[PDB]
Amino acid sequence: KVVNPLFEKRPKNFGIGQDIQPKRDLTRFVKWPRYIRLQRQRAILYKRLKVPPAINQFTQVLDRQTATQLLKLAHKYRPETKQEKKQRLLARAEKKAAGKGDVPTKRPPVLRAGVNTVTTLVENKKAQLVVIAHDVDPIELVVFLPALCRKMGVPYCILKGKARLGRLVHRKTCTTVAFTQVNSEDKGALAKLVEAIRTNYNDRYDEIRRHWGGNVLGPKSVARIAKLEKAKAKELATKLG
Amino acid sequence: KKIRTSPTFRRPKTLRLRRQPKYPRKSAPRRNKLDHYAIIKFPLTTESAMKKIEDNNTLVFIVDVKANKHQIKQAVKKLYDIDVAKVNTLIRPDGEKKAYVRLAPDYDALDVANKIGII
Amino acid sequence: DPGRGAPLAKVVFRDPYRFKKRTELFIAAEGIHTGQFVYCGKKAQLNIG
RNA sequence: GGGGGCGAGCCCCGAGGGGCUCUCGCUUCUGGCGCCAAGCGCCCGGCCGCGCGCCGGCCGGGCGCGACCCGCUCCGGGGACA
RNA sequence: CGUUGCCCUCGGCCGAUCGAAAGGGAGUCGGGUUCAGAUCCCCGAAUCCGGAGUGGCGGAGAUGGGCGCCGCGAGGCGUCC
Numbered sequence: 001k002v003v004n005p006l007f008e009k010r011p012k013n014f015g016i017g018q019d020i021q022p023k024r025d026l027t028r029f030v031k032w033p034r035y036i037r038l039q040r041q042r043a044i045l046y047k048r049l050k051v052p053p054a055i056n057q058f059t060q061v062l063d064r065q066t067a068t069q070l071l072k073l074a075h076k077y078r079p080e081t082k083q084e085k086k087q088r089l090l091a092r093a094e095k096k097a098a099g100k101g102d103v104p105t106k107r108p109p110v111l112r113a114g115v116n117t118v119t120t121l122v123e124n125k126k127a128q129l130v131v132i133a134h135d136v137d138p139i140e141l142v143v144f145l146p147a148l149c150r151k152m153g154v155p156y157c158i159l160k161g162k163a164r165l166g167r168l169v170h171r172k173t174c175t176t177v178a179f180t181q182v183n184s185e186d187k188g189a190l191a192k193l194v195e196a197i198r199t200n201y202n203d204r205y206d207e208i209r210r211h212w213g214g215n216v217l218g219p220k221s222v223a224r225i226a227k228l229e230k231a232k233a234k235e236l237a238t239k240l241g
Numbered sequence: 242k243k244i245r246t247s248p249t250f251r252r253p254k255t256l257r258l259r260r261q262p263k264y265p266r267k268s269a270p271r272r273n274k275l276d277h278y279a280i281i282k283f284p285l286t287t288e289s290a291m292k293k294i295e296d297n298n299t300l301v302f303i304v305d306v307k308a309n310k311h312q313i314k315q316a317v318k319k320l321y322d323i324d325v326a327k328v329n330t331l332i333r334p335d336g337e338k339k340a341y342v343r344l345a346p347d348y349d350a351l352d353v354a355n356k357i358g359i360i
Numbered sequence: 361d362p363g364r365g366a367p368l369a370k371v372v373f374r375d376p377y378r379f380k381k382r383t384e385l386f387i388a389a390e391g392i393h394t395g396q397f398v399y400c401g402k403k404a405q406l407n408i409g
Numbered sequence: 410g411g412g413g414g415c416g417a418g419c420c421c422c423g424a425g426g427g428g429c430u431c432u433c434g435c436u437u438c439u440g441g442c443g444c445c446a447a448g449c450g451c452c453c454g455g456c457c458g459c460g461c462g463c464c465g466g467c468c469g470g471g472c473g474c475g476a477c478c479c480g481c482u483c484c485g486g487g488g489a490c491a
Numbered sequence: 492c493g494u495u496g497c498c499c500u501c502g503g504c505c506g507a508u509c510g511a512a513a514g515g516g517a518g519u520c521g522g523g524u525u526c527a528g529a530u531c532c533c534c535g536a537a538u539c540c541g542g543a544g545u546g547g548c549g550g551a552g553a554u555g556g557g558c559g560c561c562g563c564g565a566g567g568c569g570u571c572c
């Protein structure tokens with residue numbers, strides 16, 4: 001046989017007053033440092049309070065498949081990095097006194113980045129699409145933008161990640177993004193996105209305006225209310241009906 | 242999936258580095274100003290000091306007040322090529338740390354006393 | 361306990377998390393004595409101390 | 410919220426069982442002991458023997474259950490008044 | 492074998508610090524010696540605390556009992572715990 005007698009079980013009763021309790025997870029009942037505790041109960045306030053619609057609209061962000069289309073389309077029109085900038089200048093300086101230097105050549109189209117660059121080109125109707133980030137840190141930088149966009153009739157969307165929006169350009173975050181033009185090859189793709197976007201955002205802006213949305217409760221309270229409602233329901237439902 | 246066993250949240254033990262100074266603040270190190278010399282000012286030649294020398298196998302000095310017995314011992318050994326049994330300091334009401342220094346029994350105190358000048 | 365007319369009672373339990381004998385100072389219920397057990401909680405038996 | 414089931418109240422039931430409600434999360438005769446896991450389950454490194462090696466042995470490790478799952482305020486009590 | 496760097500592993504405290512030449516607080520006593528110092532100098536007997544690596548040495552751990560041979564026997568070897 002390959003079974004010792006001696007080996008036993010020795011099971012521990014984790015009762016009350018019995019074998020001292022096992023080292024279970026306490027993630028819920030940890031005392032958190034005042035920074036953590038705050039960032040968590042900021043989020044709660046946003047759910048608990050009555051959030052007005054100019055801020056609430058940024059909850060309504062774009063859907064995954066559409067975002068992946070957009071970021072693919074932007075990958076074409078990311079702005080020129082460093083090194084690339086030197087090589088563009090260096091090639092021009094060599095070509096001036098060597099084999100005919102024209103000077104201006106023809107510059108390609110690219111993305112437009114920060115709110116101020118964008119807002120001038122929604123005032124000016126230069127933009128075809130505007131992407132906005134949903135998590136700008138003081139909201140006021142980007143609050144008017146969607147109302148301004150809908151006034152000027154520029155399709156706009158709200159993407160997740162000021163960071164991932166800002167990784168199209170090569171800086172930490174970016175609030176906004178905009179396309180003024182697009183190459184003829186990629187032209188039909190932008191127009192496919194645009195129409196899908198404006199259906200979900202610009203062409204229902206009245207519903208967005210009205211749509212308040214905080215004013216939820218703690219589930220722990222919600223559940224307590226529902227239980228009372230089930231008591232009130234069973235008080236007058238199973239009796240008559 | 243790393244669970245909190247304890248309800249505390251103590252601060253995490255971050256890496257911390259040694260100093261790697263881009264330059265030394267002070268140009269070159271301060272020379273020691275308490276050498277074999279500056280530690281032993283002079284020998285007493287007092288009646289009581291000579292009686293200590295002649296009878297107890299000691300030499301009685303005045304010493305710099307900052308000195309340890311360890312330093313004195315090392316100085317006495319260095320200056321007079323000698324070797325010590327024990328040093329036995331006090332402070333004079335005057336300010337000058339006196340030092341009674343018992344030499345080891347291979348050495349005679351009166352012989353060294355004659356070498357250093359005093360008698 | 362100086363400055364107090366009530367006597368106290370060192371009552372020792374077992375911490376139910378760390379292997380550790382925690383202890384308390386109850387004010388003595390009259391008729392408490394040493395080598396007595398002192399149960400406490402919701403499901404505690406309704407006797408003295 | 411479910412599991413667990415010794416059981417109790419109810420509902421269903423084909424008497425095997427299932428569902429809802431309670432109940433516990435299981436310790437009261439003694440001036441004891443009681444933590445750093447047993448048990449099970451699944452994986453790998455090296456060495457050895459069968460040689461098909463996630464076959465068998467020798468040595469050494471890891472993860473899971475054991476010790477349900479999810480959640481948004483640590484738990485209570487107040488509270489738009491103090 | 493140390494020493495350090497990194498990774499994992501474990502770790503409650505409880506407030507930094509100051510606060511007593513009468514509180515707490517290891518371990519020194521006899522004889523001698525000076526114009527003036529002595530549990531402090533000298534002689535002699537001690538003692539505590541720290542270190543002691545390479546471990547300086549002994550002693551303890553520990554040197555049984557079995558079985559098998561060979562030997563007159565004291566015993567020697569082989570092998571099992």
Ligand SMILES: [Mg+2]
Nearest residue numbers: 508509510511
């Ligand atoms: Mg002090």
